[PDB]
Short mmCIF file of C-alpha atoms in Angstrom, two decimals:
data_model
loop_
_atom_site.label_atom_id
_atom_site.label_comp_id
_atom_site.label_asym_id
_atom_site.label_seq_id
_atom_site.Cartn_x
_atom_site.Cartn_y
_atom_site.Cartn_z
CA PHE A 3 -3.86 -9.04 7.28
CA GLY A 4 -1.32 -7.29 5.05
CA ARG A 5 -3.92 -7.51 2.33
CA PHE A 6 -5.71 -4.29 3.23
CA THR A 7 -6.52 -1.40 0.90
CA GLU A 8 -4.41 1.77 0.93
CA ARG A 9 -7.14 3.83 2.64
CA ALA A 10 -6.98 1.88 5.98
CA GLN A 11 -3.20 1.76 6.06
CA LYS A 12 -3.16 5.54 5.28
CA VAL A 13 -5.28 6.62 8.33
CA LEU A 14 -2.98 4.35 10.35
CA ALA A 15 0.30 5.87 9.07
CA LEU A 16 -1.23 9.29 9.79
CA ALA A 17 -1.53 7.99 13.32
CA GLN A 18 2.28 7.65 13.61
CA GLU A 19 2.76 11.18 12.22
CA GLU A 20 0.60 12.44 15.08
CA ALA A 21 2.51 10.11 17.47
CA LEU A 22 5.64 12.09 17.18
CA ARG A 23 4.02 15.45 16.21
CA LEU A 24 2.01 15.45 19.43
CA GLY A 25 4.58 13.50 21.31
CA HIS A 26 3.53 10.00 22.03
CA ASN A 27 5.75 7.09 22.72
CA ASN A 28 3.28 4.68 21.28
CA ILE A 29 0.99 5.86 18.61
CA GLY A 30 -2.23 6.25 20.42
CA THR A 31 -5.75 5.75 19.25
CA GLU A 32 -6.14 9.56 19.26
CA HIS A 33 -3.82 9.64 16.32
CA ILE A 34 -5.68 6.96 14.34
CA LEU A 35 -8.72 9.24 14.72
CA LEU A 36 -6.69 12.24 13.59
CA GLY A 37 -5.52 10.08 10.70
CA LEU A 38 -9.07 9.69 9.47
CA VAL A 39 -9.95 13.40 9.62
CA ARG A 40 -6.49 14.52 8.37
CA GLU A 41 -6.74 12.61 5.15
CA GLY A 42 -9.53 15.08 4.44
CA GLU A 43 -11.82 12.93 2.37
CA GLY A 44 -12.29 9.23 2.47
CA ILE A 45 -15.50 7.75 3.81
CA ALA A 46 -14.18 7.89 7.38
CA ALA A 47 -12.57 11.25 6.97
CA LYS A 48 -15.71 12.67 5.46
CA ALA A 49 -17.85 10.91 8.02
CA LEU A 50 -16.33 12.66 11.05
CA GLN A 51 -16.57 15.90 9.09
CA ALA A 52 -20.28 15.27 8.56
CA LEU A 53 -20.93 15.15 12.30
CA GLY A 54 -18.99 18.44 12.35
CA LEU A 55 -15.66 17.02 13.44
CA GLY A 56 -13.12 18.65 11.20
CA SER A 57 -9.40 18.41 11.94
CA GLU A 58 -9.90 21.57 14.03
CA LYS A 59 -12.47 20.06 16.38
CA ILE A 60 -10.55 16.80 16.83
CA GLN A 61 -7.01 18.05 17.53
CA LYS A 62 -8.05 20.45 20.33
CA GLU A 63 -9.36 17.50 22.31
CA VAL A 64 -6.54 15.21 21.14
CA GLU A 65 -3.74 17.52 22.41
CA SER A 66 -5.86 17.78 25.62
CA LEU A 67 -5.53 13.98 26.02
CA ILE A 68 -1.81 13.75 25.27
CA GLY A 69 0.05 16.99 24.72
CA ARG A 70 3.58 17.58 23.54
CA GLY A 71 6.23 16.27 24.21
CA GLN A 72 7.00 12.56 24.14
CA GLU A 73 8.51 13.46 20.74
CA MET A 74 10.90 10.60 21.44
CA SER A 75 8.29 8.18 20.14
CA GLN A 76 9.61 5.51 22.55
CA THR A 77 9.32 2.18 20.76
CA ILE A 78 6.72 3.52 18.36
CA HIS A 79 4.37 0.76 17.74
CA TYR A 80 0.77 1.44 18.49
CA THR A 81 -0.89 1.64 21.85
CA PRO A 82 -2.71 -1.70 22.52
CA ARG A 83 -6.04 0.13 22.05
CA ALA A 84 -4.78 1.54 18.75
CA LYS A 85 -3.48 -1.98 17.74
CA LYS A 86 -6.99 -3.25 18.41
CA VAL A 87 -8.37 -0.55 16.08
CA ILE A 88 -6.18 -2.02 13.27
CA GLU A 89 -7.49 -5.56 13.98
CA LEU A 90 -10.93 -3.96 14.09
CA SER A 91 -10.85 -2.44 10.66
CA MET A 92 -9.99 -5.89 9.27
CA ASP A 93 -13.17 -7.37 10.72
CA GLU A 94 -15.11 -4.13 10.16
CA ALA A 95 -14.38 -4.74 6.53
CA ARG A 96 -14.95 -8.50 6.49
CA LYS A 97 -18.52 -7.96 7.73
CA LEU A 98 -19.01 -5.21 5.21
CA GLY A 99 -17.54 -7.37 2.43
CA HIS A 100 -14.09 -5.81 1.96
CA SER A 101 -11.16 -8.24 2.19
CA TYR A 102 -9.06 -5.15 1.51
CA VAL A 103 -9.75 -2.65 4.23
CA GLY A 104 -10.38 1.12 3.87
CA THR A 105 -10.62 4.36 5.94
CA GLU A 106 -14.21 3.69 6.79
CA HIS A 107 -13.63 0.41 8.58
CA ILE A 108 -11.11 2.12 10.84
CA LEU A 109 -13.61 4.82 11.93
CA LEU A 110 -16.17 2.06 12.36
CA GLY A 111 -13.47 0.14 14.28
CA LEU A 112 -12.76 3.17 16.51
CA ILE A 113 -16.37 3.25 17.61
CA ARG A 114 -16.11 -0.47 18.40
CA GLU A 115 -12.87 0.20 20.32
CA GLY A 116 -14.89 2.72 22.27
CA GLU A 117 -12.85 3.19 25.47
CA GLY A 118 -9.83 4.15 23.30
CA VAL A 119 -8.26 7.60 23.21
CA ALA A 120 -9.95 8.26 19.83
CA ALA A 121 -13.31 7.25 21.21
CA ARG A 122 -12.95 9.75 24.06
CA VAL A 123 -11.90 12.52 21.63
CA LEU A 124 -15.25 12.21 19.88
CA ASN A 125 -17.39 11.67 22.99
CA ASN A 126 -15.73 14.81 24.41
CA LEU A 127 -16.41 16.80 21.24
CA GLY A 128 -20.18 16.32 21.55
CA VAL A 129 -20.52 13.74 18.79
CA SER A 130 -22.06 10.48 19.91
CA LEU A 131 -19.75 7.58 19.13
CA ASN A 132 -22.50 5.65 17.36
CA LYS A 133 -23.43 8.79 15.39
CA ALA A 134 -19.92 8.43 13.94
CA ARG A 135 -20.12 4.66 13.16
CA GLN A 136 -23.41 5.39 11.49
CA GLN A 137 -21.90 8.16 9.46
CA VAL A 138 -19.14 5.93 8.05
CA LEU A 139 -21.66 3.18 7.28
CA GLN A 140 -24.05 5.56 5.38
CA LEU A 141 -21.12 6.43 3.07
CA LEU A 142 -19.89 2.84 2.94
CA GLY A 143 -22.46 1.99 0.27
CA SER A 144 -20.54 -0.90 -1.36
CA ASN A 145 -22.21 -1.04 -4.85
CA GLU A 146 -22.92 -4.20 -6.92
CA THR A 147 -20.15 -6.31 -8.48
CA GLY A 148 -20.16 -9.78 -10.06
CA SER A 149 -23.45 -8.51 -11.47
CA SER A 150 -24.76 -5.27 -12.95
CA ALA A 151 -27.78 -3.08 -12.22
CA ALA A 152 -29.31 -0.37 -14.39
CA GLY A 153 -32.82 -1.49 -15.40
CA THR A 154 -35.63 -4.08 -15.46
CA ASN A 155 -36.24 -6.51 -18.31
CA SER A 156 -38.73 -9.34 -18.65
CA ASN A 157 -42.16 -10.32 -17.44
CA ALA A 158 -42.75 -14.04 -18.09
CA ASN A 159 -39.16 -14.93 -17.02
CA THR A 160 -40.08 -13.66 -13.53
CA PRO A 161 -42.15 -16.60 -12.05
CA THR A 162 -40.04 -19.33 -13.77
CA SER B 406 11.88 -26.12 7.47
CA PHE B 407 10.59 -24.43 10.50
CA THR B 408 11.40 -27.39 12.76
CA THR B 409 12.48 -24.77 15.31
CA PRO B 410 13.01 -21.05 15.01
CA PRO B 411 16.60 -20.89 13.53
CA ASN B 412 17.36 -23.53 16.26
CA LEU B 413 16.64 -20.56 18.56
CA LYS B 414 13.91 -22.74 20.08
CA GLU B 415 16.15 -22.49 23.18
CA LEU B 416 15.33 -18.75 23.38
CA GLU B 417 11.68 -19.43 24.35
CA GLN B 418 13.03 -21.86 27.00
CA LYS B 419 15.31 -19.07 28.34
CA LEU B 420 12.46 -16.50 28.39
CA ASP B 421 10.46 -19.00 30.50
CA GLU B 422 13.15 -19.21 33.20
CA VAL B 423 13.34 -15.40 33.15
CA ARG B 424 9.59 -14.75 33.62
CA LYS B 425 9.64 -17.19 36.58
CA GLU B 426 12.74 -15.60 38.21
CA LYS B 427 11.13 -12.20 37.51
CA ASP B 428 7.65 -13.17 38.67
CA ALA B 429 8.62 -15.03 41.81
CA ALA B 430 11.29 -12.42 42.53
CA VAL B 431 8.79 -9.59 42.24
CA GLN B 432 6.22 -11.49 44.29
CA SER B 433 8.73 -11.61 47.15
CA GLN B 434 10.89 -8.55 46.30
CA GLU B 435 13.91 -8.56 45.49
CA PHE B 436 13.06 -5.02 44.40
CA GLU B 437 16.01 -4.30 42.09
CA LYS B 438 16.53 -8.08 42.13
CA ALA B 439 13.23 -8.06 40.20
CA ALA B 440 14.32 -4.98 38.19
CA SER B 441 16.96 -6.71 36.16
CA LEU B 442 14.74 -9.74 35.87
CA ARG B 443 11.97 -7.69 34.18
CA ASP B 444 14.39 -6.04 31.90
CA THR B 445 15.95 -9.40 31.02
CA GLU B 446 12.50 -10.90 30.52
CA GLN B 447 10.83 -8.50 28.06
CA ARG B 448 14.17 -7.79 26.32
CA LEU B 449 14.58 -11.56 25.70
CA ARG B 450 10.90 -11.96 24.83
CA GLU B 451 11.02 -9.39 21.99
CA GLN B 452 14.41 -10.88 20.80
CA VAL B 453 12.78 -14.33 20.63
CA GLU B 454 9.94 -12.92 18.53
CA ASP B 455 12.53 -11.15 16.27
CA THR B 456 14.29 -14.45 15.66
CA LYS B 457 11.04 -16.42 15.41
CA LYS B 458 10.58 -14.53 12.19
CA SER B 459 14.24 -15.03 11.41
CA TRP B 460 13.06 -18.41 10.07
CA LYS B 461 10.77 -16.40 7.87
CA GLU B 462 14.08 -16.17 6.06
CA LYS B 463 13.61 -19.93 6.08
CA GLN B 464 10.19 -19.18 4.59
CA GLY B 465 11.63 -17.11 1.75
CA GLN B 466 14.27 -19.84 1.43
CA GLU B 467 12.05 -22.87 1.62
CA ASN B 468 8.22 -22.26 1.59
CA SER B 469 7.40 -23.59 -1.71
CA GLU B 470 8.39 -27.21 -1.99
CA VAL B 471 6.05 -29.60 -3.61
CA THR B 472 8.56 -31.46 -5.73
CA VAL B 473 8.87 -35.01 -7.16
CA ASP B 474 10.62 -36.48 -4.12
CA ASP B 475 8.46 -34.52 -1.74
CA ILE B 476 5.26 -35.88 -3.23
CA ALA B 477 6.81 -39.26 -3.72
CA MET B 478 7.63 -39.40 0.01
CA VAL B 479 3.93 -38.77 0.62
CA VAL B 480 2.91 -41.41 -1.89
CA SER B 481 5.02 -43.89 -0.01
CA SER B 482 3.96 -42.33 3.35
CA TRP B 483 0.26 -42.93 3.15
CA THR B 484 -0.33 -46.09 1.29
CA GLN C 125 -17.05 11.35 36.33
CA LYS C 126 -14.24 9.16 37.64
CA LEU C 127 -11.09 9.86 39.56
CA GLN C 128 -10.01 6.28 39.98
CA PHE C 129 -9.27 3.90 37.14
CA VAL C 130 -8.32 0.30 36.96
CA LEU C 131 -5.81 -0.64 34.31
CA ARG C 132 -4.50 -4.05 33.32
CA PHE C 133 -0.96 -4.41 31.94
CA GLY C 134 -0.27 -7.58 29.95
CA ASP C 135 2.73 -8.55 32.00
CA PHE C 136 4.79 -6.60 34.47
CA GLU C 137 7.24 -5.45 31.90
CA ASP C 138 4.58 -3.41 30.21
CA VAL C 139 3.97 -1.56 33.51
CA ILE C 140 7.68 -0.85 33.86
CA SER C 141 7.79 0.58 30.36
CA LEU C 142 4.85 2.79 31.31
CA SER C 143 5.98 3.63 34.87
CA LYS C 144 9.04 5.29 33.43
CA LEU C 145 6.91 8.18 32.03
CA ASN C 146 3.78 8.14 34.21
CA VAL C 147 3.72 7.89 37.97
CA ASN C 148 1.29 10.72 38.61
CA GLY C 149 0.10 12.63 41.70
CA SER C 150 -2.27 9.72 41.85
CA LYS C 151 -1.58 7.19 44.53
CA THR C 152 -1.61 3.94 42.76
CA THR C 153 -1.33 0.29 43.68
CA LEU C 154 -0.13 -2.61 41.56
CA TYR C 155 -1.29 -6.17 41.87
CA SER C 156 -0.15 -9.34 40.14
CA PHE C 157 -2.95 -11.73 39.26
CA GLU C 158 -3.11 -14.37 36.51
CA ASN C 159 0.65 -13.61 36.10
CA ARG C 160 -0.42 -10.30 34.46
CA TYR C 161 0.18 -7.11 36.46
CA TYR C 162 -2.86 -4.92 37.18
CA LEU C 163 -2.36 -1.26 38.09
CA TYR C 164 -5.03 0.58 40.03
CA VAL C 165 -4.53 4.28 39.64
CA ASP C 166 -6.42 6.45 42.09
CA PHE C 167 -6.36 10.05 41.12
CA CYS C 168 -6.29 12.34 44.07
CA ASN C 169 -6.40 16.06 43.30
CA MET C 170 -7.32 15.82 39.62
CA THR C 171 -10.33 16.83 37.50
CA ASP C 172 -12.20 14.41 35.20
CA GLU C 173 -10.71 15.63 31.82
CA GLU C 174 -7.30 15.74 33.55
CA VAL C 175 -7.78 12.09 34.46
CA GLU C 176 -8.91 11.12 30.88
CA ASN C 177 -5.81 13.04 29.74
CA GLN C 178 -3.31 11.27 32.04
CA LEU C 179 -5.18 8.00 31.56
CA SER C 180 -4.45 8.19 27.79
CA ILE C 181 -0.71 8.15 28.53
CA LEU C 182 -1.02 5.22 31.04
CA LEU C 183 -2.96 3.33 28.40
CA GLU C 184 -0.23 3.86 25.85
CA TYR C 185 1.15 0.66 27.43
CA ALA C 186 -2.11 -0.55 29.10
CA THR C 187 -5.85 -1.10 28.53
CA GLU C 188 -8.80 -0.38 30.91
CA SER C 189 -10.03 -3.44 32.81
CA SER C 190 -13.73 -4.09 33.43
CA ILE C 191 -12.83 -5.70 36.75
CA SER C 192 -14.42 -3.98 39.72
CA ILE C 193 -12.02 -2.31 42.11
CA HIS C 194 -13.66 -4.01 45.17
CA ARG C 195 -12.79 -7.40 43.68
CA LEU C 196 -9.12 -6.32 43.79
CA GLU C 197 -9.47 -4.79 47.30
CA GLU C 198 -10.72 -8.16 48.60
CA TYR C 199 -9.24 -11.09 46.54
CA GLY C 200 -6.13 -9.33 44.94
CA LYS C 201 -2.35 -9.89 45.28
CA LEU C 202 -0.26 -6.78 46.01
CA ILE C 203 3.24 -6.16 44.71
CA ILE C 204 3.73 -2.44 45.39
CA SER C 205 1.26 -0.04 46.94
CA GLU C 206 0.68 3.70 47.33
CA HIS C 207 3.07 4.91 44.74
CA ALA C 208 3.05 1.73 42.70
CA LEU C 209 4.15 3.28 39.42
CA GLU C 210 6.90 5.27 41.26
CA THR C 211 8.06 2.04 42.99
CA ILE C 212 7.99 -0.03 39.78
CA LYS C 213 10.57 2.40 38.36
CA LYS C 214 12.80 1.72 41.41
CA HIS C 215 12.29 -2.00 41.35
CA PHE C 216 12.50 -2.12 37.55
CA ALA C 217 14.05 0.06 34.96
CA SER C 218 17.56 -1.33 35.01
CA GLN D 125 -32.15 17.27 -9.45
CA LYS D 126 -28.43 16.53 -9.85
CA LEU D 127 -26.07 17.63 -12.57
CA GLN D 128 -23.70 14.69 -12.38
CA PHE D 129 -24.43 11.15 -13.51
CA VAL D 130 -22.60 7.87 -13.57
CA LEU D 131 -23.38 5.87 -16.69
CA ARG D 132 -22.28 2.30 -17.47
CA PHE D 133 -20.92 1.11 -20.84
CA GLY D 134 -20.65 -2.58 -21.62
CA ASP D 135 -17.62 -2.29 -23.88
CA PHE D 136 -15.17 0.32 -25.13
CA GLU D 137 -17.02 0.63 -28.41
CA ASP D 138 -19.93 1.97 -26.41
CA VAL D 139 -17.66 4.72 -25.10
CA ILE D 140 -16.90 5.93 -28.64
CA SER D 141 -20.59 5.85 -29.38
CA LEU D 142 -21.37 8.26 -26.49
CA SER D 143 -18.32 10.37 -27.30
CA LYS D 144 -19.21 10.73 -30.99
CA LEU D 145 -21.77 13.51 -30.34
CA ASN D 146 -21.52 14.17 -26.60
CA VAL D 147 -19.12 16.19 -24.48
CA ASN D 148 -21.98 18.43 -23.42
CA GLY D 149 -20.02 21.30 -21.83
CA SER D 150 -19.71 18.65 -19.20
CA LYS D 151 -16.28 17.49 -18.27
CA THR D 152 -16.56 13.80 -17.95
CA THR D 153 -14.45 10.87 -16.75
CA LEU D 154 -14.12 7.29 -17.97
CA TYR D 155 -13.29 4.40 -15.68
CA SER D 156 -12.51 0.73 -16.30
CA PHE D 157 -13.93 -1.66 -13.73
CA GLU D 158 -14.90 -5.34 -14.20
CA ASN D 159 -14.21 -4.75 -17.94
CA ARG D 160 -17.22 -2.37 -18.10
CA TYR D 161 -16.45 1.32 -18.70
CA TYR D 162 -18.20 3.79 -16.38
CA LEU D 163 -18.61 7.32 -17.62
CA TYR D 164 -19.13 10.09 -15.18
CA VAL D 165 -20.63 13.18 -16.73
CA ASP D 166 -20.45 16.26 -14.59
CA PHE D 167 -22.49 19.11 -15.93
CA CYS D 168 -21.25 22.54 -15.01
CA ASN D 169 -23.35 25.55 -15.95
CA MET D 170 -26.49 23.69 -17.01
CA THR D 171 -30.03 23.62 -15.63
CA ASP D 172 -31.93 20.45 -14.64
CA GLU D 173 -33.95 20.23 -17.91
CA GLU D 174 -30.81 20.78 -20.04
CA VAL D 175 -29.19 17.89 -18.24
CA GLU D 176 -32.31 15.60 -18.34
CA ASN D 177 -32.52 16.50 -22.08
CA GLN D 178 -28.89 15.55 -22.66
CA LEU D 179 -29.16 12.51 -20.36
CA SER D 180 -31.77 11.09 -22.75
CA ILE D 181 -29.24 11.25 -25.61
CA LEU D 182 -26.44 9.82 -23.39
CA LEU D 183 -28.58 6.80 -22.52
CA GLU D 184 -28.93 5.95 -26.20
CA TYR D 185 -25.28 4.82 -25.94
CA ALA D 186 -25.18 4.10 -22.23
CA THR D 187 -27.43 3.02 -19.38
CA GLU D 188 -27.87 4.71 -16.00
CA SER D 189 -25.65 3.09 -13.37
CA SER D 190 -26.45 2.51 -9.71
CA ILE D 191 -22.98 3.65 -8.68
CA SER D 192 -22.63 5.77 -5.56
CA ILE D 193 -20.27 8.51 -6.62
CA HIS D 194 -17.77 8.40 -3.68
CA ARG D 195 -17.43 4.66 -4.28
CA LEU D 196 -16.49 5.41 -7.90
CA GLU D 197 -14.03 8.17 -6.88
CA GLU D 198 -12.35 5.82 -4.38
CA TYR D 199 -12.50 2.12 -5.36
CA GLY D 200 -12.72 2.72 -9.21
CA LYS D 201 -9.99 2.87 -11.92
CA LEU D 202 -9.33 5.84 -14.23
CA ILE D 203 -8.83 5.69 -18.00
CA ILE D 204 -9.34 9.34 -18.85
CA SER D 205 -9.84 12.27 -16.51
CA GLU D 206 -12.40 15.08 -16.80
CA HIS D 207 -12.66 15.58 -20.61
CA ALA D 208 -12.93 11.78 -21.13
CA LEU D 209 -15.43 11.82 -23.98
CA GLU D 210 -13.30 14.38 -25.93
CA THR D 211 -10.28 12.15 -25.29
CA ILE D 212 -12.18 8.99 -26.26
CA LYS D 213 -13.05 10.39 -29.71
CA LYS D 214 -9.33 10.40 -30.43
CA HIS D 215 -8.60 7.25 -28.41
CA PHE D 216 -11.45 5.08 -29.77
CA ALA D 217 -12.67 6.48 -33.04
CA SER D 218 -9.23 6.27 -34.66
#
């Protein structure tokens, strides 16, 4: 969209860092996942960490899916799976309001994009993929706006 | 504005011819005679796409015009 | 789990890009169908994690098709068999 | 119960009003969002009653917002960090 929030874009850029740092020609989905947990906190980042998937848990699997090298980062654009995850966050934020996409939507989007390298990282580390999409959702509260909420006034105004 | 790519509309036409050559060559093989055809194809393809957004320079040049004459052309255009 | 996977590459050129860094100890056969090139990797002498591993790499340029392998085996169109990735490097790199 | 609350102010003048007798040993942070000011009090080294007590007072000048705290922390907009009320007494009583 190019009209995303920072938070989305940040997990994604963290993907490229893991692309070369783990040696991947194309920045795989495994790195987008790492991106979420490596930004520490953020509703996605936190979410994975809730299920018990810290950066520790993730990376052991991740390096076991594509190890070093491939430090060349041969035409580093995403993997098509990983590119799908970016498209996915956009819609995973549309449905959940958000025209400007955050971390959360990407983790939600990973789950969606469930045959991806990311997806396998989590399904290998004992955390059900849907347990993760849940986790993001239950922290993606999305409070009231265009309105306010803090109390209850009026009786007769109710029926009318 | 964007009546073509930069006039690089011919590029897409080229890339077609490649794909074909490539495709048909690989279906028969023409092993290395497919080789160079692949390389020429996807090379070209990406080049096309690079220059298809080279008249995004034509976007930053042109893409707001809603001027007197412009409108006026429309006002005569519909009737 | 699985020791044979079926990958679709968007066009041949994607397979070439890929072939040039994965060819595997996995006999592998490459079809052309719908003008897109399919690659059927068949891991022989691998373990399931080892295949998910490798399969990551493959899928840096590809995605995993839902198309049954016996559909290919009957109604497919071969381009290079047995060491399809290996051959694609021959028949495409230059 | 909790020792951190998110309170909503309808205008800046409301923020002075809270500030003008409350800090509360509670470092506290003031946001701007949809022209309302949110004030996040975060009580450190108080018990539940001491906070409920205080929270009474607070809600003379504020109301109790429905804001999920990690939503605030993320998608909000800062005006004054932790020590916001203290800062507001300068920045809105003068």
